[PDB]
Structure 1
Amino acid sequence: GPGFDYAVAMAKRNIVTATTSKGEFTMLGVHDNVAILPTHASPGESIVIDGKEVAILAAKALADQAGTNLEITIITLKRNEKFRDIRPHIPTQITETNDGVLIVNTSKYPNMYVPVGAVTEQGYLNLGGRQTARTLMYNFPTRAGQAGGVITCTGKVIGMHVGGNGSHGFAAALKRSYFTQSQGEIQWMRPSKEVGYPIINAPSKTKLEPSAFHYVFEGVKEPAVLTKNDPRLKTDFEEAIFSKYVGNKITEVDEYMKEAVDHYAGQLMSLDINTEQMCLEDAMYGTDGLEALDLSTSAGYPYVAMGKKKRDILNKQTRDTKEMQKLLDTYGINLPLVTYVKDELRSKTKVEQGKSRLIEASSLNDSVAMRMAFGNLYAAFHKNPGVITGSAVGCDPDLFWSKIPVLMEEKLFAFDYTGYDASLSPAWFEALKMVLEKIGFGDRVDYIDYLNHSHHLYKNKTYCVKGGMPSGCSGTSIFNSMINNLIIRTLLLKTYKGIDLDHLKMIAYGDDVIASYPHEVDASLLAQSGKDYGLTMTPADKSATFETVTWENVTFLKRFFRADEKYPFLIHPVMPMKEIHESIRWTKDPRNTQDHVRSLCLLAWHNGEEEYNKFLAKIRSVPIGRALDLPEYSTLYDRWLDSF
């Protein structure tokens, strides 16, 4: 029989003998360094295993939702001893079997395998002094000290022996849950050298240095943490940066999402997007509604390991493709994403807690391939920022801010997401595929699969991520925005049952969304419905409670909305000075103070004439500042009126 043979096979590498201050026990090694044993076997600071001492990093007792004991403790051993990951053998729920086997192994009961027959649920048990729950009953005169032993059946490890009453034997039922699941973070990981890929170099030291205005203005942000030994860290870094991946919350597209899909794909058809493919040249060198390949960003794999930038490939005015074509025929597509730590400014917390953001750069091949595939889709969205596309990607706030309120419905609502790009369950990509599918792109939905399921080359490792939207791929913003559209709809449909999406007016830019409806909706109620779809929603502008969003307090890019005094329907996109002060204090190339400070003024002046003058006054309080060619308020304000 294979049930017996199974019991032996599991035991051969996942069952060991453990000695506590309360005798020998059979112990199931569940995964890595995690093993379980009966609670009454009170684990101490250390423990004797197959001959010698092993320390306990930390132990955990187990109880249920009622507080009732489960009679299971999950200890953690301090050693390089890796158990076979046998979590998958543990059932997801309390399992009964008509032909179970008790596995015990101590110096008192060596290699014991008992055919205990039927294994049914006992429910509530009253085991010596301490009442227990989630137990299984098998009718076999279980003797003392067989505790710890495991109960299996062909292909399943269902219970842990914890006791008996002379006639019967009892075991605490085992469930997958009980061990932090491996469906999140990463799917699998391992040494790049073991799977053909090469090691990725990464600048260790940051390229952000204090600017000429570091003391002129105040600020608290600092360059993000970039290596393991940054003394500013207050936690393990490796662990901290990967804690972004939270793993799939859902797989299936439910009715709400399908109808969210139907409606939004529906809206996109009034746009009459050109469902053709985009020629290589246009995808590369740009066309109407689409800027050429960004030369700043990385070239990705395998172009980084071969030392070859995007500049060395493109002929800006020659507009030559031959070079790029030969590459696409050679290295194909669907290539691993190179992963860098994003070198940027971060808050006091996100430095201490190592929350440095990661860059996953798509290979130039994918990059170009997806532009040929979705180029026309992108151009459509860029030439149409609004409430049809539901996208603000490509907009020009100086001008677009005056249209937004016209486009918006009567009662605004909005909220903040928390690690949006990574919280996107594979179910949302399928939803996204469906939308394409409906607007005449079902032809190349395979590319979304590429975004959902992607392997990354981190530094020393390669790993595959099943879920979440990568950060450095073509279309990222638009696809995130489109996905966002699907989400708001889904949540509205589920919360406010029988809503009317045709009066949903919203605009997204990635995770950022400004929405509206003729009736005031409850952000709170939605944020809850959000949990179910694996999304973490909190009140807009990092606010304490969910409050009513007004035109006086809503913010759409990091900017506010304020009417002009001379023309009540011209709306200034007001960027808070604090953000500008932060940014001006650091620089990655002090040969651009002119372009950098310039760019900031174009944001700062919408703060009012009184404000913007102080700002220049301060820039001009130091030599590098006075020697700068900066626009006066009128020059800008005047130009801004002719803008429209």
Structure 2
Amino acid sequence: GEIQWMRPSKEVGYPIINAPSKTKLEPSAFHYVFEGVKEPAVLTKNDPRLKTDFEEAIFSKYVGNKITEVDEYMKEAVDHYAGQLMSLDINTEQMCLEDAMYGTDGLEALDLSTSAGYPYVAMGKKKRDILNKQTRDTKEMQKLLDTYGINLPLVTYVKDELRSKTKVEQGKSRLIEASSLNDSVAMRMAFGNLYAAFHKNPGVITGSAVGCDPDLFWSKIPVLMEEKLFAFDYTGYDASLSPAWFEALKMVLEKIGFGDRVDYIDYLNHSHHLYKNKTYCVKGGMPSGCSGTSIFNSMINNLIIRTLLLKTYKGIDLDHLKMIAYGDDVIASYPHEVDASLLAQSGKDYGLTMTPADKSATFETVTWENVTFLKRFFRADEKYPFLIHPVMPMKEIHESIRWTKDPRNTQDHVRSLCLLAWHNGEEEYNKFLAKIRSVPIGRALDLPEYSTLYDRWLDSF
């Protein structure tokens, strides 16, 4: 990923974009009842907490484009992955505007809470308008697709969320590159069934985990993996992607019946962005707020791991590479041990910065005891060991519960945390509930007891 040029949006006929300057995150009723060290992320250059320029920091994620062409290894990776996806009979048909907007089996309806994007954000019009849950009115939308047409600019927003102190002092705030409602609808029509196929098949055939339900899926993973597990973290995955990785992605799409509309991939790759008063053009880099970002990032991860393996171990048998990705997160396996540190080295050559799994200091062996996927561990249940517990650390839950963005959603926010929390065991869960109930707001909440959660879990399989 690399910014080719940036300049004043007025110079090119674009309206300044208004983004709230104040966070919506305030201490919650549980702020002092639990521990935590995270604060809201910097949303402006004027934040007293800053210890370096904001703009330089938020955009430093674009480390550049390391590779230019798709080499021999990448091409092989493409053939293999595309070969696997082939076995899913993915329906190559387009998706009718109705299903793309209000969803169908395998695909959820569009989310009304996220930015409608340009030009709407600058016109003040929102999603509530165009979309009618019970109506299913294509008309208004359909009309808009002719008036403004696809392939429109991406509105860049600073993600309003909790970050470590360092990420606050270093302006390391994440940005949200939002796509126009028009594009989201288009792509969902173009790829709609690809998404559904992926959502309906989390595992090692799609090599994807998007759309999965951790409570059920965790018990299926161990069986799918090969003997030896390997993993690693990516630093700035999305922004590090070079155009070549997008071409490889198009080759996969073409090979499975979507060559028809691989142009859509070109806009993710070479893209136009609006941020505040400035406008910029980026070469490479997966935008964080487009339709499919998650799935396309996972597909690219499947090509990356394959590529690094072929480049480092001539003779490797990709048929026994069992991996599952969720964007940049990944959990992989092979019948034989491999040198992650070595693989990370080849990774640099492809423009990927890979480091020991879970901020380790060195690349150590990956086990079912220390491996994490989506910040969650895998823990077999005491009573019935064949059922696996996705275990989110309590630290994560503690940090989250200490803040709020809307007191109206306190019931839902805490309930959600409870559904992640109990997998840590009855003792821990009850200590968690106790503290929640040690202040008025908590005592008024309708929270599930351990037993109720555990019994429900057992019956869900």
Cα shift at 1:503: 0.2
Look up the match of 1:424: 241
CA distance in 2, matches of 1:598, 1:568: 26
Task: Report the Cα distance in structure 2 between the residues aligned to 1:462 and 1:270, rounded to whole angstroms.
Answer: 43
Q: CA deviation at 1:474?
A: 0.3
Deviation at 1:496, TM superposition (A): 1.2
Q: Residues of 1 paired with 2:268 and 2:333: CA distance?
A: 30
Shift of 1:223: 0.3
Root mean square deviation of aligned Cα: 0.7
Q: In the alignment, what sits opposite 1:278? A: 95
- Aligned-pair identity in percent equals 100
2:401 aligned residue: 584
Deviations 1:261-304 (A, max 9, x none): 00000000111100000000000011000000011110000010
> What's the CA shift for 1:222?
0.5
Q: Distance in 2 between matches of 1:592 and 1:368?
A: 29
After superposition, what is the alpha-carbon deviation per residue over 1:228-261, rounded to whole angstroms, capped at 9, x for unaligned?
1101011011111111111211120000000000
Checking the alignment, whether the CA contact within 8 Å between 2:233 and 2:357 is kept in structure 1 is: yes
Contact 1:436–1:445 under 8 Å retained in 2: yes
Cα distance in 2 for partners of 1:530, 1:244 equals: 17
Tell me the distance in 2 between the aligned counterparts of 1:453 and 1:529.
25
What is the distance in 2 between the residues matched to 1:467 and 1:247? Answer: 8
Aligned-partner SS, 2:106:
coil
Give a deviation string over 1:529-581, Cα, whole Å, max 9, x none: 10000000000010010000000000011100000011111000000000000
C-alpha offsets along residues 372-425 of structure 1, whole Å, 9 cap, x if unaligned? Answer: 000000000000000000000000000000000011111100000000000011
SS at match of 1:630: coil
Give the 5 Å matches for 1:424-503: 424-503=241-320
Separation (CA, whole Å) in 1 of partners of 2:190 and 2:440: 50
1:591 and 1:198 map into 2 onto residues whose CA distance is 34
Distance in 2 separating the partners of 1:286 and 1:199: 33
Q: How far apart, CA to CA, are the structure 2 residues paired with 1:250 and 1:426?
A: 8
Tell me if structure 2 keeps the 8 A contact 1:187–1:465: yes
* 4+ long deviations beyond 2 Å: none
**Residue 185 of structure 1 pairs with residue 14 of structure 2:** no
Q: 1:185 offset after TM fit, Å? A: 3.8
1:247, 1:312 → 2: CA distance?
A: 40
- The one-character-per-residue Cα deviations of 1:432-472 (angstroms, maximum 9, x if unpaired) are 00000100000100000010011100111111001110000
Q: Is residue 2:448 matched to residue 1:621? A: no
Kept in 2, the 8 Å contact 1:185–1:243? The answer is no
One of 1, 6, 13 as aligned partner of 1:196: 13
Asked if the contact 1:278–1:375 (Cα under 8 Å) also holds between the matched residues in 2, the reply is: yes
| Residue 163 of structure 2 is aligned to residue 367 of structure 1 | no
Is this contact kept in 2: 1:276–1:376, CA < 8 A? Answer: yes
Whether the 8 Å CA contact 1:299–1:310 is kept in 2: the answer is yes
Partner of residue 418, structure 2: 601
Contact 2:392 2:423 in 1 (8 A): yes
Deviation at 1:643, TM superposition (A): 0.6
Q: Secondary structure at the match of 1:271?
A: coil
Asked whether 1:415 is paired with 2:232, we answer: yes
**Aligned with 1:524 (options 321, 335, 341):** 341
Contact map agreement 1:423 1:535 (CA 8 A) in 2:
yes
C-alpha separation in 2, matches of 1:311 and 1:476: 23
Find the partner of 2:33 among 216, 220, 228: 216
Describe the superposition over 1:64-113 as per-residue Cα deviations: whole angstroms up to 9, x where unpaired. Answer: xxxxxxxxxxxxxxxxxxxxxxxxxxxxxxxxxxxxxxxxxxxxxxxxxx
CA–CA distance in structure 1, aligned partners of residues 339 and 421 of structure 2: 33
CA distance in 2, matches of 1:544, 1:620: 39
For residues 190-212 of structure 1, the C-alpha deviation after alignment (integer angstroms, 9 at most, x for no partner) is 11011111110010010111110
3-state secondary structure, aligned to 1:325: helix
For structure 2, the residue ranges without an aligned partner over 5 or more in a row are: none
2:96 & 2:365 partners in 1: Cα distance? Answer: 47
How far is the alpha carbon of 1:516 from its aligned partner? 0.1
- Tell me if the contact between 1:350 and 1:356 (Cα under 8 Å) persists in the aligned partners: yes
Question: Secondary structure of the residue that 1:311 maps to in structure 2?
Answer: helix
For residue 530 of structure 1, give the secondary structure of its aligned residue in structure 2. helix
2:184–2:290 CA contact under 8 A, matched in 1: yes
What is the rounded CA distance, in whole Å, between the counterparts of 1:610 and 1:369 in structure 2?
A: 49
- Are the equivalent residues in 1 in contact too, given 2:2–2:285 (CA < 8 A)? no
Q: Tell whether the 8 Å contact from 1:422 to 1:468 is kept in structure 2 after alignment.
A: yes
Secondary structure at the aligned position of 2:10 is classed as helix
**1:370 Cα deviation from its structure 2 partner:** 0.2
Kept after mapping to 2: 8 A contact 1:247/1:425: yes
Corresponding residue SS for 1:498: coil
TM-score, with structure 2 as normaliser: 0.99
- Rg larger in 1 or in 2? 1
Map 1:90-101; keep pairs closer than 5 Å. Answer: none
CA contact (8 A) 1:386 1:392 kept: yes
Q: Distance in 1 between matches of 2:113 and 2:369?
A: 37
Q: How far apart are the structure 2 equivalents of 1:462 and 1:593?
A: 37
CA distance in structure 2 between the partners assigned to 1:565 and 1:457 by the alignment = 52
8 Å CA contact 1:339, 1:360 repeated in 2: yes
Cα distance in structure 1, aligned partners of 2:150 and 2:34 = 47
> How much does 1:189 deviate?
1.2
Describe the SS at the equivalent of 2:125: coil
**More helix per residue: 1 or 2?**
2
Contact 2:66-2:242 at 8 Å conserved across structures: yes
- SS of equivalent residue, structure 2 residue 453: helix
The partner residue of 1:544 within 361, 373, 381 is 361
Whole-angstrom distance in 2 between the partners of 1:277 and 1:341: 33
**Distance (whole Å) between structure 2 residues aligned to residue 441 and residue 289 of structure 1:** 18
Structure 1 match to 2:142: 325
Q: What's the TM-score, normalizing by structure 1? A: 0.71
Aligned to 1:259: 76
Q: Which has the higher contact order (CA 8 A, sep 6+)?
A: 2
Unaligned segments of structure 1, at least 5 residues: 1-183
* SS state at 2:364 partner: coil
CA offset digits 1:170-189 (Å, max 9, x no partner): xxxxxxxxxxxxxx741011
Task: Please say if residues 2 and 284 of structure 2, whose CA atoms lie closer than 8 Å, have aligned partners that are also in contact.
Answer: no
Distance 2:30 2:273 in 1: 38
Q: 1:567, 1:506 → 2: CA distance? A: 26
CA distance in 1, matches of 2:195, 2:426: 37
| Partner SS for 1:194 | coil
Counterpart in the other structure of 1:292: 109
Aligned-pair distance for 1:349? Answer: 0.7
**In 2, distance between residues paired with 1:570 and 1:563?**
6
**Partners in 1 of 2:444 and 2:110 — Cα distance?**
34
